[PDB]
Tab-separated table of C-alpha atoms in Angstrom:
chain	number	residue	atom	x	y	z
N	1	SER	CA	-18.037	-204.623	111.536
N	2	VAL	CA	-19.439	-206.777	108.633
N	3	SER	CA	-16.538	-207.270	106.103
N	4	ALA	CA	-14.310	-207.045	108.987
N	5	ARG	CA	-15.870	-210.045	110.569
N	6	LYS	CA	-15.532	-211.726	107.347
N	7	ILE	CA	-11.915	-211.188	107.414
N	8	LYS	CA	-11.830	-212.571	111.060
N	9	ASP	CA	-13.784	-215.748	109.607
N	10	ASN	CA	-11.639	-216.053	106.569
N	11	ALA	CA	-8.187	-216.009	108.433
N	12	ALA	CA	-9.068	-218.727	110.828
N	13	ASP	CA	-10.754	-220.913	108.001
N	14	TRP	CA	-7.731	-220.715	106.107
N	15	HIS	CA	-5.427	-221.831	109.105
N	16	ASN	CA	-8.142	-224.860	109.909
N	17	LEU	CA	-7.910	-225.765	106.332
N	18	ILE	CA	-4.032	-225.820	106.058
N	19	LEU	CA	-4.136	-228.030	109.311
N	20	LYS	CA	-6.711	-230.721	107.963
N	21	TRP	CA	-4.619	-230.530	104.522
N	22	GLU	CA	-1.494	-231.681	106.791
N	23	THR	CA	-3.407	-234.341	108.587
N	24	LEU	CA	-4.781	-235.816	105.325
N	25	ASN	CA	-1.341	-236.025	103.954
N	26	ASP	CA	0.273	-237.852	106.602
N	27	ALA	CA	-2.599	-240.605	106.549
N	28	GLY	CA	-2.058	-240.614	102.532
N	29	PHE	CA	1.734	-241.198	102.756
N	30	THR	CA	1.303	-244.046	105.425
N	31	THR	CA	-1.024	-245.587	102.850
N	32	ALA	CA	1.017	-245.428	99.783
N	33	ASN	CA	4.268	-246.410	101.799
N	34	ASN	CA	2.288	-249.674	102.798
N	35	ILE	CA	0.988	-250.158	99.015
N	36	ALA	CA	4.772	-249.842	97.958
N	37	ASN	CA	5.839	-252.359	100.460
N	38	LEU	CA	2.998	-254.894	99.424
N	39	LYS	CA	4.017	-254.270	95.774
N	40	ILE	CA	7.724	-255.043	96.161
N	41	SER	CA	6.685	-258.202	98.516
N	42	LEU	CA	4.400	-259.129	95.511
N	43	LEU	CA	7.071	-259.046	92.876
N	44	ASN	CA	9.938	-260.188	94.952
N	45	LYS	CA	7.908	-263.307	95.971
N	46	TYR	CA	-3.783	-260.760	96.781
N	47	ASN	CA	-6.295	-258.378	95.280
N	48	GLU	CA	-8.644	-258.046	98.034
N	49	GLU	CA	-6.073	-255.860	100.328
N	50	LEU	CA	-4.632	-254.319	97.484
N	51	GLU	CA	-7.978	-253.079	96.378
N	52	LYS	CA	-8.812	-252.380	100.093
N	53	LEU	CA	-5.790	-250.258	100.293
N	54	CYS	CA	-6.238	-248.331	96.907
N	55	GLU	CA	-9.904	-247.734	98.410
N	56	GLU	CA	-8.642	-245.784	101.607
N	57	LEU	CA	-6.375	-243.917	99.179
N	58	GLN	CA	-9.175	-243.019	97.328
N	59	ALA	CA	-11.122	-241.829	100.247
N	60	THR	CA	-8.065	-239.580	101.514
N	61	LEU	CA	-8.379	-238.018	97.824
N	62	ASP	CA	-11.821	-237.459	98.047
N	63	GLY	CA	-11.338	-235.614	101.510
N	64	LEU	CA	-8.594	-233.384	99.782
N	65	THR	CA	-11.116	-232.845	97.118
N	66	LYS	CA	-13.845	-231.606	99.929
N	67	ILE	CA	-11.332	-229.172	101.375
N	68	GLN	CA	-10.555	-227.560	97.643
N	69	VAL	CA	-13.981	-227.127	96.948
N	70	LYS	CA	-14.254	-224.964	100.364
N	71	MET	CA	-11.203	-222.959	99.335
N	72	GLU	CA	-12.651	-222.196	95.920
N	73	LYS	CA	-15.831	-220.908	97.485
N	74	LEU	CA	-13.904	-218.933	100.170
N	75	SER	CA	-11.727	-217.074	97.654
N	76	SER	CA	-14.834	-216.645	95.534
N	77	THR	CA	-16.780	-214.795	98.529
N	78	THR	CA	-13.421	-212.837	99.173
N	79	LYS	CA	-13.600	-211.636	95.557
N	80	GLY	CA	-17.247	-210.870	95.859
N	81	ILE	CA	-16.770	-208.781	98.902
N	82	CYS	CA	-13.867	-206.792	97.183
N	83	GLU	CA	-15.868	-206.173	94.246
N	84	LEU	CA	-18.837	-205.049	96.534
N	85	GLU	CA	-16.820	-202.525	98.112
N	86	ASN	CA	-15.174	-201.434	95.134
N	87	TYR	CA	-18.663	-200.793	93.726
N	88	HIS	CA	-19.809	-199.158	96.645
N	89	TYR	CA	-17.199	-196.707	97.389
N	90	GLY	CA	-16.856	-195.730	93.889
N	91	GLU	CA	-13.917	-195.162	91.500
N	92	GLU	CA	-12.173	-191.846	93.176
N	93	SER	CA	-12.084	-192.393	96.779
N	94	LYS	CA	-9.423	-192.637	99.096
N	95	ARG	CA	-10.512	-195.401	101.413
N	96	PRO	CA	-9.335	-195.754	104.848
N	97	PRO	CA	-8.332	-199.423	105.940
N	98	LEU	CA	-10.710	-201.662	107.833
N	99	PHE	CA	-7.540	-202.749	109.830
N	100	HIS	CA	-4.418	-200.166	110.540
N	101	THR	CA	-2.787	-200.499	106.916
N	102	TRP	CA	-4.031	-202.925	104.394
N	103	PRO	CA	-6.468	-202.663	101.707
N	104	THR	CA	-8.555	-205.693	100.621
N	105	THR	CA	-7.076	-206.232	97.060
N	106	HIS	CA	-3.979	-207.575	98.726
N	107	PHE	CA	-6.413	-210.340	100.554
N	108	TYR	CA	-7.586	-211.126	97.054
N	109	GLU	CA	-3.972	-211.739	95.656
N	110	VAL	CA	-3.077	-213.577	98.614
N	111	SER	CA	-6.070	-215.916	98.238
N	112	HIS	CA	-5.572	-216.361	94.519
N	113	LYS	CA	-1.911	-217.515	94.514
N	114	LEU	CA	-2.836	-219.912	97.462
N	115	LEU	CA	-5.697	-221.089	95.715
N	116	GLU	CA	-3.356	-221.691	92.482
N	117	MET	CA	-0.706	-223.345	94.497
N	118	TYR	CA	-3.195	-225.853	95.917
N	119	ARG	CA	-4.969	-226.346	92.934
N	120	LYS	CA	-1.756	-227.631	91.241
N	121	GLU	CA	-0.593	-229.788	94.004
N	122	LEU	CA	-3.924	-231.816	94.340
N	123	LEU	CA	-3.623	-232.659	90.415
N	124	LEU	CA	0.098	-233.887	91.184
N	125	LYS	CA	-1.539	-236.252	93.733
N	126	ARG	CA	-4.185	-237.550	91.576
N	127	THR	CA	-1.426	-238.706	89.003
N	128	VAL	CA	0.486	-240.136	91.633
N	129	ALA	CA	-2.568	-242.160	92.922
N	130	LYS	CA	-3.298	-243.351	89.333
N	131	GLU	CA	0.064	-244.293	88.582
N	132	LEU	CA	1.316	-245.829	91.699
N	133	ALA	CA	0.292	-249.208	91.798
N	134	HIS	CA	1.449	-250.144	88.363
N	135	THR	CA	4.889	-249.178	87.813
N	136	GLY	CA	7.846	-251.587	88.314
N	137	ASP	CA	10.849	-249.566	88.149
N	138	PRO	CA	12.050	-248.946	91.918
N	139	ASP	CA	13.624	-245.477	91.139
N	140	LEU	CA	10.424	-244.258	90.042
N	141	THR	CA	8.465	-245.683	92.872
N	142	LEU	CA	10.964	-243.545	95.171
N	143	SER	CA	10.282	-240.417	93.036
N	144	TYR	CA	6.453	-240.990	93.625
N	145	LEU	CA	6.693	-241.321	97.162
N	146	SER	CA	9.014	-238.430	97.282
N	147	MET	CA	6.528	-236.317	95.430
N	148	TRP	CA	3.779	-237.239	98.098
N	149	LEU	CA	5.898	-236.212	100.685
N	150	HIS	CA	7.706	-233.254	99.605
N	151	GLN	CA	4.778	-231.309	97.779
N	152	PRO	CA	6.912	-229.381	95.109
N	153	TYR	CA	4.013	-227.190	94.372
N	154	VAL	CA	3.397	-225.630	97.573
N	155	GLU	CA	6.189	-222.987	98.466
N	156	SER	CA	7.442	-221.930	101.600
N	157	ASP	CA	7.213	-218.198	101.834
N	158	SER	CA	3.468	-218.360	101.225
N	159	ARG	CA	3.438	-219.484	105.014
N	160	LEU	CA	5.026	-215.929	105.671
N	161	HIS	CA	2.043	-214.617	103.828
N	162	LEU	CA	-0.372	-216.660	105.807
N	163	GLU	CA	1.032	-214.887	109.051
N	164	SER	CA	0.715	-211.585	107.189
N	165	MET	CA	-3.173	-212.168	107.489
N	166	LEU	CA	-2.462	-213.478	111.153
N	167	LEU	CA	-1.310	-209.847	111.848
N	168	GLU	CA	-4.141	-208.126	109.942
N	169	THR	CA	-6.753	-210.220	111.937
N	170	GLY	CA	-5.277	-210.486	115.188
N	171	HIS	CA	-5.588	-214.238	116.329
N	172	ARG	CA	-1.770	-213.950	117.227
N	173	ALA	CA	-0.946	-211.577	119.652
N	174	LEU	CA	0.714	-208.314	118.871
A	1	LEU	CA	-19.668	-247.304	82.574
A	2	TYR	CA	-17.078	-246.665	85.096
A	3	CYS	CA	-14.697	-249.301	86.612
A	4	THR	CA	-11.569	-248.447	88.878
A	5	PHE	CA	-8.751	-250.757	87.745
A	6	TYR	CA	-6.409	-250.423	90.636
A	7	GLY	CA	-6.843	-246.828	90.984
A	8	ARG	CA	-7.060	-246.060	87.590
A	9	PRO	CA	-10.394	-244.843	86.267
A	10	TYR	CA	-11.942	-246.153	83.113
A	11	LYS	CA	-14.581	-244.634	80.840
A	12	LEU	CA	-16.590	-247.152	78.540
A	13	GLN	CA	-18.850	-246.389	75.999
A	14	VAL	CA	-21.273	-249.240	75.122
A	15	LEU	CA	-21.836	-249.243	71.334
A	16	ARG	CA	-23.899	-252.685	70.840
A	17	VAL	CA	-25.603	-255.256	73.040
A	18	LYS	CA	-26.645	-258.867	71.709
A	19	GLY	CA	-28.494	-260.822	74.103
A	20	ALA	CA	-30.070	-264.184	74.505
A	21	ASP	CA	-32.964	-264.373	72.400
A	22	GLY	CA	-30.870	-263.034	69.361
A	23	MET	CA	-32.349	-259.738	69.184
A	24	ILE	CA	-29.824	-257.182	68.574
A	25	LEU	CA	-30.015	-253.337	68.960
A	26	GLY	CA	-29.087	-250.609	66.284
């Protein structure tokens, strides 16, 4: 009722963090599309509203950095409770599962691969926010906006994996 | 010193300051 409640907290906090990542990504895409439209209206034809738009893009990136910090500490305490159970139950022990079937090392690998994917995607977003306001080739501008929108380091099947914890916690009805 | 030129962060390292009274540093 202690470790299982930590799984109950961890799956719900995972789902809530994915929802706030999607809201911040929509705000960032609207600000970046306005930045590119202001740049092409500059070059086809100033620093205050361009600096203001770059500053709210920086505030969006700071919010995503805070979400990644909470992701890293959630995976770290999941690693800590799996190592605590592995130290407490000994080596040669056939452990019954906390829910019906799954052991806790599967939760550790799910959290590790989700953490790796979102950590790579945040670094690509920092490079896009570095290089967006200075470039002049419009194909590269469309490529940078497509890298913001389509998120090429976040894979689709990991959503299926998130729903596996939603059938290991029970927030969704069986 | 840290300045953000249009989103790009810059790292500046100060080597020498020469002031108004003519006294320089090392």
